[PDB]
Design an enzyme around this catalytic site. Structure first.
Site, PDB file in Angstrom:
ATOM      1  N   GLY D  39       0.741  -1.247   0.000  1.00 35.66           N
ATOM      2  CA  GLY D  39       0.000   0.000   0.000  1.00 35.66           C
ATOM      3  C   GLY D  39       0.774   1.302   0.000  1.00 35.66           C
ATOM      4  N   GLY D  40       1.994   1.288  -0.517  1.00 31.56           N
ATOM      5  CA  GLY D  40       2.768   2.511  -0.637  1.00 31.56           C
ATOM      6  C   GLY D  40       2.132   3.486  -1.614  1.00 31.56           C
ATOM      7  CG  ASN D  48       3.684  -4.741  -4.748  1.00 32.18           C
ATOM      8  OD1 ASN D  48       2.952  -5.228  -3.891  1.00 32.18           O
ATOM      9  ND2 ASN D  48       4.760  -4.028  -4.445  1.00 32.18           N
ATOM     10  CG  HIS D 263       7.887  -3.181   4.218  1.00 34.42           C
ATOM     11  ND1 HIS D 263       7.283  -4.147   4.971  1.00 34.42           N
ATOM     12  CD2 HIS D 263       6.905  -2.383   3.779  1.00 34.42           C
ATOM     13  CE1 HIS D 263       5.991  -3.943   4.990  1.00 34.42           C
ATOM     14  NE2 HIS D 263       5.735  -2.883   4.261  1.00 34.42           N
ATOM     15  CD1 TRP D 264       8.257  -3.134  -0.564  1.00 36.88           C
ATOM     16  CD2 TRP D 264       9.391  -2.624  -2.398  1.00 36.88           C
ATOM     17  NE1 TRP D 264       7.785  -1.942  -1.020  1.00 36.88           N
ATOM     18  CE2 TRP D 264       8.466  -1.602  -2.148  1.00 36.88           C
ATOM     19  CE3 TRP D 264      10.219  -2.525  -3.513  1.00 36.88           C
ATOM     20  CZ2 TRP D 264       8.346  -0.506  -2.962  1.00 36.88           C
ATOM     21  CZ3 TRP D 264      10.106  -1.439  -4.308  1.00 36.88           C
ATOM     22  CH2 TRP D 264       9.178  -0.437  -4.037  1.00 36.88           C
TER      23      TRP D 264
END
Lengths: 284, 284, 284, 284
Positions: D39-40, D48, D263-264
């Site tokens: 949700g960036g 994504n 985080h990714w």
């Protein structure tokens, strides 16, 4: 009891004359307690423990020592591992003042100096009170460097007022504590050529081959005295997960956590902190 | 102050007359504090808080209540979720004695009843002191059931003296506390036909459709008062990792951990426990 | 495949002469992988990785070593800190076979041995796969000794078939793995006199003055290779909280956790463990 | 493969009409897997899972959905709790495509959405793969808001290119992933007026009275399917301590942790994530 009434100095030898500034109070009291302050930019004994010294002076013989590099103490431009460097100085001052085995109360950087003293000269240190301390702390969940460590580095690199404020804001839960006067006072103390020399030395000290002496979490299992660990639930510099190793390995350890409290425990929860320390140190 | 001087009874209604046994002391004191005991076999208010009641009586108006199923309180043979069941009874007794908003001090099972009371009747409960409490505790690392829960189950299934001793041994850090007299006293209290009826009811209560009311860790974020969580570092029944959710979610929470201490905090560290509670509850 | 097909022997020098027994397979294959088994009573390389050796041999050159004290290797009557003693024997096996830098796979005691070798003989170790490992674990929440460690201790003092079964059940999540055949087989092995002498030589090496060599949590930060830690969520011997310091300090670490899995990962989750190990090592 | 090849559309009814945009691939394959993105700001299904969609399509029927507010789906100006709002849209897409019980893969907000769907529409969800997920996380040690959450909040208030870059860097371990192209691309997307309206509609849904629907940590114990949690050890948005309650309460959970990963996960460890996901789902 003022900055000036309680001031005192001494000269000790760590690879050469080293001047230490300090504060003293409760001079008729039986038990002596040494307070060691945390380490931001422009930090010192008095601004660190002003909400505590007078209260502690009623019970204890209080010695709050500016650590080399801070306050009115020698800002040499070269030193080794900082906690060791500061314990050695403290050893000198003990020997001079003729203190025997004393209880140490230090937070953050001070707590690391405290623990380092305590491991290096076992016989000289009694009960420990450690507030969100560095050294024996190791964050098992928080990626390093933390928010608070990053904001300090940023200021070390570009010492602006905006950078200092950003740093002070992650010092506390209640950010209303960060006032214009506070930021201005720390910025002035911190922006002197002497303080920046100190800042440079600390920076270079990290590459030293002695880095292992900062990793006290490997060592605190050797501590024999009672140790009181004190943490703010919202500490963003030395977070709560960094208390686990210490709590687990120190035989006579105790942990107290304050919700709604940041890195500055002795300020944000000054009243409960005071009572807790006094009681843990036997009431004098 | 003896078992008998402080005894008292009352009758309250939880789906029908329910008798509660209790203890009372410090009757001239302004502030009233309710103590709720932990829940082993043969456990009760007095054996739980004997090292604490007299000390607390100097400051507070003390009410230590045998929880339905324990002590000299009705051992019905049918009940719902136990913490709720016991909060309802406590509600009845408050209403009777005309207590308003009171501070609760309960450990283990008592702490769960405490928290359950506190969520179910918000206005009636003040500051909480919770010692290695069930309910709001959830062990994030320890496989369930724990050693202490297993040893209790074993005794519930085969109530021998050997089984009871094994259970009591994981109650404490210092196993010297488990004496012949202690085991004998608990075994006798616990091996009555009434106590076994109570043991059967508790067992059946776990299958009830209301199990969710025992999962208070989901709910304590709703608590508004200050809460003091107290844990023994060596608690083998409700281990330390079970304190994390509560510490994190309760806005005004505090945590104190004692090294060298098991599940019986109020016994093994009775002195520090006492001072801590008194101070946290405002000294009366 | 089988015992005697794969069986093999060697004779190295640890403060004298030492017979190590091993198991060889996949001699065709291009990459060599050492296995190190767990340290339960009557445990050995083959029965430990029985569900793993075949599958791994289709990819690697497998060397499953019986550690000193186990299987068909020398069970001496005393030694120093056991992991370091087992790492000295293995380094000996290394030079004798002109082994280079090799990956190491080891659960429990085996994991501890592997880590210790990897720290003692740095050039000699590569990718490591540790399943619920000893030494490098430190239970931040679980009170020591853990429940599984107590059962083992219970068996050493009193090596009955009942005490062994009690230990084996605390080993797994699915208890149906503990067949009476299995108990019979381990207990046959464990109760010989040579086994019990190793069991006793070990249990008193704990008291050495080289105990610190077993506190590997203090050291793993020095590890340079990729390490994969695998753990069962319900491991009652080396619980999940033991994995934290290592996940944190080992630069190239990785953690995988299986729910509904106990202390024997290579058995209870053989497939997943195999596939995961094969991939981490490089397909070979 | 590409955007428009895979591109697709639908129109379901969430309190009105709602356009969802998705991406389709591997229509040949036998098993259907839903993906849900993070949700960036300026994030969407394709960018994504760009390093993941192809590889997964060789095994499964891939449906990568743009969540309401992102990509080419309706960016409305208000909604309720976002995950539940996104789960209602997806349930709508489910019935429209006669989907059965399907596995779900989702990082961050996507993970939160997935969990919430899995809890709302129980018959409709199967194996779940959550990478550093929201909602079901609760940071037991990390002070909220975290550092990554603050950067995002900083961008909403002040959507500059600098504030977006500051956010994207806190996203990864290897910062070289944050190319100026990448910044340009997201910032182009994020700064449209329709994007900022979603960014603002979201940031005030936090204040709803249905906030509790976002506290999934409270609920996941009800999940019946195998869940695999993947996390980067250095995730500064949803840190590693957030994974604890879920690992604990979800019966069939599993955790994998990558060191040197932020985080990714699907990006920084694309290969391992792919292989791990493919195997967890069943090879397909």
């Amino acid at each position: 009891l003022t900055f000036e009434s309680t001031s005192r100095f001494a000269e000790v030898d760590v690879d050469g004359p080293l001047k230490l500034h300090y504060h003293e109070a409760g001079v008729g009291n039986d038990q002596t307690v040494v307070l060691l302050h945390g380490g931001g930019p422009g930090a010192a004994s008095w601004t660190n423990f002003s909400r505590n010294i007078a209260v502690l002076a009623r019970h204890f013989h209080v010695l709050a020592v500016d650590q080399p590099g801070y306050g009115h103490s020698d800002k040499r431009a070269e030193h080794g591992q900082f906690n060791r460097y500061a314990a050695m100085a403290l050893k000198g001052l003990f020997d001079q003042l003729g203190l025997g085995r004393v209880p140490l109360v230090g937070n953050s950087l001070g707590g690391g100096t405290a623990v380092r003293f305590a491991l290096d000269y076992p016989a000289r240190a009694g009960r420990l009170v450690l507030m969100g301390p560095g050294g024996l702390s190791i964050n098992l969940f928080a990626p390093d460097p933390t928010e608070g460590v990053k904001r300090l580095s940023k200021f070390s690199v570009a010492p602006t007022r905006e950078n200092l404020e950003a740093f002070l804001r992650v010092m506390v839960y209640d950010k209303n504590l960060i006032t214009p006067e506070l930021v201005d006072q720390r910025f002035a103390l911190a922006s002197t050529p002497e303080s920046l020399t100190a800042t440079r030395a600390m920076g270079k000290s990290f590459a030293g081959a002695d880095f292992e002496a900062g990793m006290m979490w490997r060592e605190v299992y050797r501590l024999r005295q009672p140790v009181l660990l004190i943490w703010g639930r919202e500490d963003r510099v030395n977070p709560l997960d960094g208390a686990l190793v210490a709590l687990k390995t120190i035989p006579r350890a105790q942990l107290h956590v304050f919700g709604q409290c940041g890195h500055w425990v002795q300020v944000e929860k000054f009243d409960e902190f005071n009572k807790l320390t006094i009681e843990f140190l036997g009431g004098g």
